[PDB]
Symmetry: D2
Subunit: 362 residues, 4 copies
């Protein structure tokens, strides 16, 4: 019924997914004209393929089209984006240009595809979620995540209110006509505040004895337990479930995964490997080395480091600028030589389109 | 074969059109993926239909999505506009989409033939810029773009250079895969300068006895004759030919169409009905009344007033503000009463998100 | 002492104004550099002057730089507008600057008191958003910003929360170093919901016998009484108080001003003259004629029609396009003749860069 | 005479500078209102200070505000920028935020100033130069470079036409009221084409025997010689002279400098150290190490690597993504540990403002 509204949807795309709305609701909200969203269809479908066929898909947070491009050139199969739809659009433009540069230079395709799926952070209530989903679909995003926190510490929203938001995003995907992936994130591991205790599913985790904050928020007992409950409640309304964590731990990841799987067998999971966590201090080399592999086997099929690009950029430029300050051109020469050494690995920035365009014109 | 590269192109769309490049050139520049540009395909095909079926298509320059929407509301069949251009084209289309979505959701049918009236846009450096600007307009959902032969008194570029711009625009449209209309505009009626006498076709109009100017420009005999020569040369590289004029003159317009039609019978033409020309002072009431109808019969199938939105916006607000200053709310109530009175004629600017909310909260 | 931190602030600018923060708080947040915000200083100081010197200042909502320019051209003394907001404020000011530059270069004197009419703008999440949005508007050159107490039927936030928004906006203005006007708007006349009953000042209006709603909102007695209570509480944290109304009513407006003035004599007020209200149908011609003058005498020193530009734009283009469809150039010539006729009253939209070129080519 | 129009201008700022226009031209084009451009005044004045007091100022090309910020944090005294004014604005925003973070965290100033001068590439004829200069002054740029090429290979414009552009930029700086630095760049070392031979200063370097290209351009004999002539012609119309070079060579840099100094003793020079040139292959370690120092002594007081940020970003992310592909978290851990090791050097991204703002509010 919904499969005909979403012509590019693969077989079994919506197995286990519940919608608040109806097929007639989608048609009514659709307009009279069909507009194709090619990048979004392709991306969503490639991401759906990958998370079902690979041991796991890992991604890094990109700040720019060039960063995204290097990730794809390096062999990574997806892009994470942490202003959002604008960057997704910019990213898809530079990926398109990389593909076009290759084909115009007479070169074959050096990657699975230049259009690696983009999974983006949707940063209001349900009409906001609706509009943002649309924006990302227009931009060509493959998947979009929605978190149950409100824009001390983080403030959660009621379970029912997040479920409305997830439903609003599915409705937006349905109206656009794309099988766009929806990721539900819970912030309940570290969140100490909650807007309202109205939802009975949330009242078990309320620290009533702390009373309300001066601003009227409820105080909550954080940890894995409310994350499990929330994840279970969200499961029918998303494609992947994500528990935000600032303390990476395989045993806790396993605890979460098994608990979710009791209620929803085979449910696909997402995992953020925290860039703030001190990996080397807390985990031995062998644990660090196997971490993503072992998470993948638990059902964490989409894994990422949110601020990877940020850390890489800032650290790279600081070191560059420091050497340049003290040793001037010797510093840049070191970078250049490193770039040269990487060309064997597949680096191309040192080793055309507007030449081929020009010849076609004349 | 170019019809395979542009699958929405109607039969005979490219009769009489010459391309400097090949189908293989298109493939090499397109890349490995086919992105659909639905609104661009729709707009181009609708404009193509309109100019072959209507006595003529007349448009007004829109400055905003709302102005454009009112044009379509009132029964106009096309929109004119002059990176801000593509952004405006994108905005107009968003506003048109909304109007369509609102009326679809109301389930009473549409109040218009279609909300997606074709947009014809002004592409006002070289042929690579023409290529990129055409790409941007197609992404925006524009139906036609015009390219002029003046360097941005006026200074012409060589005939060969403009043909390169025109072909680059066609190349762009072929790569995107859309049958976008190209309008060639000549500024030779008034222009007395030319960048270079390189082209044999321009040389007969060069005043060699006079020097180059201090800027190095060639001096050139202006008027209808160079307009005719350039039009005839441009004709195979565009879909409509447009001679710019400062003086609206039915006799000259007939002279131009006849000369162009000598070389290319049935060639479709466009005409700007100058907003800066004082119509009532220089033309009698009957000539004004028949002006556009007369042009249509000569082959001017696309006609427009470039700054119509600008003058309408500025005058209306001046007068409102003058009344508001003088008599406060009385002045606004008069506007409001005029809006109600207009409702009989299809005015509506005195729902959808309500129906969205409803769909979410099921 | 805050006058040192805001050097353009006129004498007594801050009489009766309370700040939750200190001068030292301002210094720590300002940083080591003092950036000048000339248009913001000018606008704020001019608005401050106008509202203390004029019977009242009345404005219309502008949608573009050109609309705003026509308002000033026609003799209006201020502009109303509702990240798009700050961008529009910046655009309006650019257009005003140009108008000023054009007339200065013509060396005949200006046709207005000043081109830089104060802009009052709508700041439509929390107090940090209010802080950032105020900063953006000040950079844009806005003179005043309004902040409302509804969550973006309507749902109120607690009285204490809005005071935090208001103070954050003041903090923002102090940090930027500008005497920007803050308008507090209350939506309590119509609002029946409240996010939290945390604040003792709101509790007397809460219907405790009714539950919370399904979303967790408190149900609340609406009307002028909670408007009065909130206004009085907001008064020390703003420069003008604004009660939102859907029904224009001189008697209620007097009732509100009198009650507010009980607590804070001489408090300046603002009033939106609703565009959606049917004026002629619900008010007699004399009441309409006197409406704004009457409000001014009660202390409503800033009055505005929020959507005036929208209705004027949409109606004018609808009618133009209707005439154009029917009679082509005749319809435009009529507009043009109306523009010429208006020139007598100071209309000019029927030079500078010429004088620039001249200066370059010496 | 001009010093009073530019109140922040230091003593001797305009020694040796010729203007086509007059002080009265500036006043006429100024408007009636004075708008301060604090970042532009400060930046231009700090850059003027530095290039006169330091052995040389070296800079790297920044792609983003964060890159710029790390450069400043590393101790570099200026920023190079190679969409432009928008990025300069973004850069100045993130530099302001770094300063504000420090002061709000109770920390002293860890750098000379966070507002390191920005020198930017101005990427039309003289009215374009005028408008771009203004845009950059608004954005807070310290200096702006204008090149004598037109938007096979590069095409030069006549000497007179570039001089018009330089004059247009000075007029824009004069009208804005800022002592903004102007850099004249010549592209004559590698450029093989020229739009027109109209200027007798250019005719000595025209390869008449090659004839005109099919597009009408003249062919030119490139190298140091036409660079010297052009630089000498531009000298009175700029603050720094820059010869674009793709082959770094001290002897040639010296030849250029001495030749310019014969005509204009003490003239300040700029130099781009090419990122495409293979440093290690062509120069020995000792030459690489002294390169900038020795250039500085020749009068090259502003030196830069145009695409440094681009190369750093692309290379950094490629290597990151490669290790991550093959070793997952081990790769990120290596980056993190390197970030930790750099904190001793002054790196802070791993080791607040919206906390201090929040406390001030409440």
């Amino acid at each position: 019924d919904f499969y005909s509204l979403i012509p590019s949807a693969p077989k079994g795309r919506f197995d286990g997914i519940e919608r608040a709305h109806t097929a007639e609701d989608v048609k009514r909200l659709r307009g009279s004209v069909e507009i194709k969203y090619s990048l979004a269809e392709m991306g969503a479908n490639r991401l759906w393929k990958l998370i079902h066929e690979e041991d796991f898909v890992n991604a890094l947070g990109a700040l720019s089209g060039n960063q995204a491009m290097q990730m794809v050139r390096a062999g990574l199969k997806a892009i994470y984006l942490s202003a959002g739809p604008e960057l997704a659009k910019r990213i898809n433009r530079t990926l398109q240009r990389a593909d076009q540069i290759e084909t115009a230079e007479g070169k074959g395709l050096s990657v699975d595809t230049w259009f690696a799926p983009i999974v983006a952070d949707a940063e209001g209530d349900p009409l906001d979620a609706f509009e943002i989903m649309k924006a990302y679909i227009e931009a060509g995003a493959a998947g979009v995540h929605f978190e149950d926190q409100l824009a001390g510490g983080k403030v959660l929203i009621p379970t029912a209110a997040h479920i409305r938001n997830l439903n609003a995003a599915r409705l937006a995907a349905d109206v656009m006509g794309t099988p766009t992936l929806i990721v539900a994130r819970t912030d309940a591991e570290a969140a100490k505040l909650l807007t309202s205790d109205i939802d009975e599913r949330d009242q078990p985790f309320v620290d009533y004895e702390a009373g309300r904050t001066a601003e009227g928020f409820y105080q909550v007992k954080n940890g894995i337990e409310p994350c499990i409950a929330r994840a279970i409640a969200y499961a029918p309304y998303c494609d992947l479930i994500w528990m935000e964590t600032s303390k990476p731990d395989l045993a806790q990841a396993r605890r979460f995964a098994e608990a979710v799987h009791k209620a929803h067998p085979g449910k696909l999971l997402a995992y953020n490997c925290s860039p703030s966590f001190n990996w080397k201090k807390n985990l031995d080399d062998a644990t660090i080395a196997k971490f993503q592999r072992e998470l993948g086997a638990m059902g964490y099929k989409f894994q990422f480091i949110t601020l990877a690009g940020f850390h890489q950029l800032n650290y790279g430029m600081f070191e560059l600028a420091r050497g340049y300050k003290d040793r001037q051109m010797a510093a840049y020469s070191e970078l250049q030589q490193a770039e040269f050494a990487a060309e064997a690995d597949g680096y191309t920035a040192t080793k055309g389109y507007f030449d081929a365009v020009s010849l076609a014109i004349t």
